[PDB]
Amino acid sequence: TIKCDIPINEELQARINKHVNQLRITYSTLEEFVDNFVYELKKGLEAHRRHPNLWIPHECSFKMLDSCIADIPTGQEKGTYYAIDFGGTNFRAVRASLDGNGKIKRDQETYSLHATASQLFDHFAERIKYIMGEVGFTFSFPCTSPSINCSILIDWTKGFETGRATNDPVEGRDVCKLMNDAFCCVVNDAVGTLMSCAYQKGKTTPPCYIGIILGTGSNGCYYEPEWKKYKYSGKIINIELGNFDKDLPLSPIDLVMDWHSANRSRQLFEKMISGAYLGEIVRRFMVNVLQSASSEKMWKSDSFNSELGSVVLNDTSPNFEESRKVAKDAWDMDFTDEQIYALRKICESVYNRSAALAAAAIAAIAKRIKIIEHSKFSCGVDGSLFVKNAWYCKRLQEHLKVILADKAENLIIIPADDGSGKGAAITAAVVSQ
Amino acid sequence: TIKCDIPINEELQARINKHVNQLRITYSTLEEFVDNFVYELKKGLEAHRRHPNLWIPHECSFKMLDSCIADIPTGQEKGTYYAIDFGGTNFRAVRASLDGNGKIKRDQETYSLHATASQLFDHFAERIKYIMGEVGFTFSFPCTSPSINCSILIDWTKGFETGRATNDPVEGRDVCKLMNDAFCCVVNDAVGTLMSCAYQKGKTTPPCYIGIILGTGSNGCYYEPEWKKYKYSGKIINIELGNFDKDLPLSPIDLVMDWHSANRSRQLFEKMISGAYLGEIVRRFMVNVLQSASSEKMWKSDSFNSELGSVVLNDTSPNFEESRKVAKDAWDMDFTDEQIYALRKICESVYNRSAALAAAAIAAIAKRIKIIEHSKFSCGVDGSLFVKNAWYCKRLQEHLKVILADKAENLIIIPADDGSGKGAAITAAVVSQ
Amino acid sequence: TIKCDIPINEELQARINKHVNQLRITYSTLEEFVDNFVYELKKGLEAHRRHPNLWIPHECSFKMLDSCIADIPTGQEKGTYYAIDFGGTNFRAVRASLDGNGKIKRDQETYSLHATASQLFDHFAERIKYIMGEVGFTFSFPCTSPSINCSILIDWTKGFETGRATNDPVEGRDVCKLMNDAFCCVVNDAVGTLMSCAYQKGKTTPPCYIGIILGTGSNGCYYEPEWKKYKYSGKIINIELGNFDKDLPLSPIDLVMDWHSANRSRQLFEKMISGAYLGEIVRRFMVNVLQSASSEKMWKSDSFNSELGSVVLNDTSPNFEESRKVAKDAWDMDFTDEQIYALRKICESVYNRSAALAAAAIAAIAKRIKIIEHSKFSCGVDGSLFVKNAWYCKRLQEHLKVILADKAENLIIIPADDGSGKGAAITAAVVSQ
Amino acid sequence: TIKCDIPINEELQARINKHVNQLRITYSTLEEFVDNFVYELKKGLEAHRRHPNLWIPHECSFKMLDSCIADIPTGQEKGTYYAIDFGGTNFRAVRASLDGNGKIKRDQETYSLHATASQLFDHFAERIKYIMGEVGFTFSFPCTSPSINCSILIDWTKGFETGRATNDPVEGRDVCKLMNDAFCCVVNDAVGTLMSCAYQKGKTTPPCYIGIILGTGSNGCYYEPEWKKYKYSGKIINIELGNFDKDLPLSPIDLVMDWHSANRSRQLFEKMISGAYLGEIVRRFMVNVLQSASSEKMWKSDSFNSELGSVVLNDTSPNFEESRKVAKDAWDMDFTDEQIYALRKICESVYNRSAALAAAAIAAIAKRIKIIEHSKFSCGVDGSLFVKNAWYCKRLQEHLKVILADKAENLIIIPADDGSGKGAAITAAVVSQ
């Protein structure tokens, strides 16, 4: 709670309090959220028993995809592999080498960003060729993979949008096939994190069963003991939890920002907790509060990132001249001392709601394994929102400690800064073996 | 089309065109609207055969209520009756006398407007007593009437809201019972219009089968030949067509204005074509277009009626100084010559959409009787939007002529300015007989 | 488990086992049933806050009606009242007198059973007049009561069906009004039981908060502390739990028996646990098992009651010649010793499923008050299925003990044979006071 | 209408009339069916504009798949090709040669039928090798084809069921890939018929725009002018019309037969008009009519084909001793002269409903092109039900003539006995060109 004492307007305070109560979250809501989530999950496993290749989104809005990984690696091997990444704010290319134990090194010097797949994969090939001058692959999108070497996607989430031409944009073909034209073992981000938290940590912490990505997207993978009952091969399941529907709270700003998107009526849970939309949400709140006291630029979309929000949050300067530069170079508004308070309040409330819902999702995944009471297990958390934002990591663990009260010290959160980059390489540790 | 030639900003024109295309309506949409409406109607008759006292809104969002009227009056009688009205912007009280033919006269000098039914009906009784110093009743709300003398409502639409106290606000009791405490034959507005268009007109125009109210609300009644097949007594059915759902087009302004209402998720078709919300819609458009060029008052809700919109529409003054007074005394904004164009454009587009949807509803009701090809019949139109606004009556008949092209000169529109006031009295013409 | 050892056919055993597994119930299902029920309940309270007179069955298939009772009686009074009952297999008429404590006596000598309400209430009046020759009322149907003295119903459940004539069958009018034409304080069956379990028991058992009716119907009422939060007056709420929908298990016999009913697509939970349909379900199972070994009469509907099922269950005769008379005088089939085993097995399985689901409903209502852990409270059970069938009362308490394991000895089941008859009279104990 | 005059039982006649009225179809239903179908179709095109690789079955239960065919062949070429078929009651293998005009010849000597794809495609390879000893492919299942050479399916309809083992049954992989392991240009049945009706017919009949398959399955393809507007490449669209949902009539036999199937809750329109289920439906009707007068074998599933129904229909023998052999060798029931009448009546009614619904589907597809009024076009009909059953082809054209009355002589029905076998070969006429 900020609760700044500087004398502010007696009317603007009401417009602040209204929009703050709009974003308020209470534990009576999270306690229903958890049960909604676990019900959805078991229903999705049931549904996967019936039709192992249909989705049928009017039951289990999660498309609980299968990851053919059948062996959580032990971390005892060697090898040097080249790997490609894609999906985040910019793709990467890693030239990694492994150690006989947890340690692992990488070069990974790499760069990235009416447009078809030809020019895109031409850029892919040219970049990997440039980097080649001194195996696996990662695609961070919803893919339906028959086996390890083969993977085909369904659509184009995250706000990304490939051009619409006769050249048949990427959505609708196997990726390993289209890759070889430019030039193994394709995986996703969450499974990559879950793997990378096995080779890395060891001998002191309980094993890891949950992999969470909080960043440009929001996704999760987890380990399931009953993978033999529900017929599909693979110890860990990829939830596409960015598609939760049931009763999540929605302020009108959310409805407006959803009416103005390509993936309309889908990916509703992702649009509240992911880094791609938090800046837009904050900007749209900061207009119904200033009320024509704003500038001409504050009405222009995509003019406030989540990175600037992370700066406004981590504001411990004696005066607030740190965020003043952000406000000035983003909106050309020389804010007084009465409006920066509103800005800080709004950023705090928005990111607080995001952290609370993410913690609720993590706890609801945890309660499903039911091993929390018997023993302990760890969850590896990755993403730009989590590790690159200190104010986030404390609110998240607070909201998590409050939810699963009694059994709190059985789910250890492990930040995994290595990213899915190392996971793409460690993918070889099972296929090669 | 306005298409004013005065040089305006080259950017503001884009913000105008975007919001204009947002409200655009095309005949490819109306041609599906009509079929949607007729399907809904027949489905509702089917549903009424099964359960004649349940609603079940997940089939036929129309609650096709029964009106016990079993005789379209002939118009040959006499008598002086007192009657009460209620439902519009203000209730009335009429002391009418009838003639041996179409003519009819009335005194109807009357006045009107955490609040319970005791004080409300106390005001009712005191007003009718005051007027008494030289039968029927009208309640313009959704009522489930077992017979003529008895009527009980279900909820409180139109934006009206009776106070919430232990005194059990009006929603949930028979009206004729609660009336006698203050002090016959209760009807609604649409059936009142349909009756009042029988006594009034005669000997030159085909009989009337449709009654439409377009004003603070939007409602319809119609005559059905198959009233014997579908089991309920009464020649005419009251559609509560303010509850259409299927695929009506919604701009984000509509979603925002619906999130801020008491009757949320219900009465969705009424919120686009009724006079109670047009001013609010125009005000909410006139902020995303001026973009901080607005005043402090333009952000205050309920500060622009539909009456002022009717003035801005009927603007034939040499200069636009007629609407300038409206803008000034409503928002304290001395508009230049570049913004009044935007105001006129927005009002035109909004009221145009309203008129188009109303005409679509009328034509879809007409196509259901199927007697349009064989013979001709008339529809009596009433309401503050229709008769008290000259720009509306021409756009409405244009959009109606375009829809039912070939058989246009078989549905004659009759403006009935007498209102349901006379209909309340003529109700006695069947019960007394 | 019967598990009879007499040598039977090796094929007929397979046809028995298939239909037995069709009706199998497991605790993994009940553990989801309870959570479904509690979720539905809280959702219904939420919904009642919004619209206190609409139903909207696509949220909360329970129509959680209000009972204006605001005082659980203490049981210290006197008085002699006449009361009328209706709803079960036959209506009653009671002339009861009260005692200064728990004791209460009654005369209640009474009789009962294209047909309109005129002749029905004529029979009512003639019977009550005949009995008059040496206050309250009970209507066992879904009624929407504004206050105590006034009550209007919605439809006609239980299989009852009033004739369809112009005389406007009973569905759609206030009952207290239509009663006076023949000749207070109308209540329902569940609230009647809940009241009658307060005057009767005392000083040794914890107070009662749940009233359950299991018979021709299946209904429940319960006490809610938060009746002030959710806006309606009355300490106890009448759940119409015969309308549960979510995921109840359905064998094809259920679909066929539901396609052949008047209240189609509604009252789905009642059709599996109520006494009006158990005989029909058993008869329809006993044809797909005997497979043309049946008689001509076994294909005739309504030829096997639940009373005969209670006789077949309570079969402790040395030989099975007790149920042989039932089979003979019901189907004219002189069953051998190989088919009576099938009959007993089928009756056992059906009534077992019924008892299990009823116990699940009771436990799910109990878990909602949340007072089970702190203190203890009792539930009063009434109905023809419960008290008039000894085999039922043991299976029910077994299935209840298994569900709420740890806190079992905090919910005491009290059989209330007095019926709602005494409750109708005790209704006066609050209105008179 | 049969209306046999032989004196039959006066009670059995009632049991016949009840089940006959259960299957009755009236034109007031078909007139709504057509509009339902056309609405669904346009909605599906709209939906395909948005997401060209998702299905989302809660809008447009048709998965209006794309067929990359961009040139209706002209029929002027030569060539000898080998082709494979699959999907019907048994797969085929054709060695066809073409002529410089409509004529075409083929050898096509071929045979066919806990089981994985390895052994299945081993049988495929061994059979094609055996036949090789003196290009295209056809897969009659729902497949999502990115291009011509590549095709991947989604699930396993028609009642077919590949074994469930770790070997990953066929559902979920590209077919052209898995084919080469055993050993072009994969198409479906409806598009095959539509192609084969272009090379074959010419110079006298208007061009063909509709391809219908009525047999073990029921499917349709059609030509669309607006294929440029809705973004996908290909002049003709494959409707998977076996998945219609909206309001098709269902007798309880349908619900029971649907509860006992693998593809439960899906493929609901196919289960009423396709040849795979008509025999089962007739058998299940012929038990509730004979009522224990049946045999032990009449209660055994899959004991009556549609081929025997075609024999019972085409019964013009002086006595009915032709169908008597069918009844005897199928059920071991020496039917009297009073039961064969019931059998004929039931078969007639069932196949009549099937033909009526198929004609409704054809007419509803026709009304969508809207070219019926301006010019004429032909539809090529194929399948075991149509050409191999003379009683079907007359009822179908009757029901079609009644539906589209005025414009009847603009849609010419062309029986195409050649099958999709020739279409698989003619597929080369566009890819080779």
PDB file of C-alpha atoms in Angstrom, chain B residues 32 36 39 42 247, chain D residues 32 36 39 42 247:
ATOM      1  CA  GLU B  32     -30.238 -11.938 -41.378  1.00  0.00           C
ATOM      2  CA  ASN B  36     -33.376 -14.391 -36.696  1.00  0.00           C
ATOM      3  CA  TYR B  39     -37.264 -17.854 -35.959  1.00  0.00           C
ATOM      4  CA  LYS B  42     -42.077 -19.122 -33.769  1.00  0.00           C
ATOM      5  CA  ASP B 247     -26.160 -11.553 -32.900  1.00  0.00           C
TER       6      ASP B 247
ATOM      7  CA  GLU D  32     -37.168 -24.926 -41.081  1.00  0.00           C
ATOM      8  CA  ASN D  36     -31.157 -23.858 -40.364  1.00  0.00           C
ATOM      9  CA  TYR D  39     -27.620 -20.226 -41.761  1.00  0.00           C
ATOM     10  CA  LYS D  42     -22.842 -18.941 -44.018  1.00  0.00           C
ATOM     11  CA  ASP D 247     -32.923 -29.321 -33.916  1.00  0.00           C
TER      12      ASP D 247
END
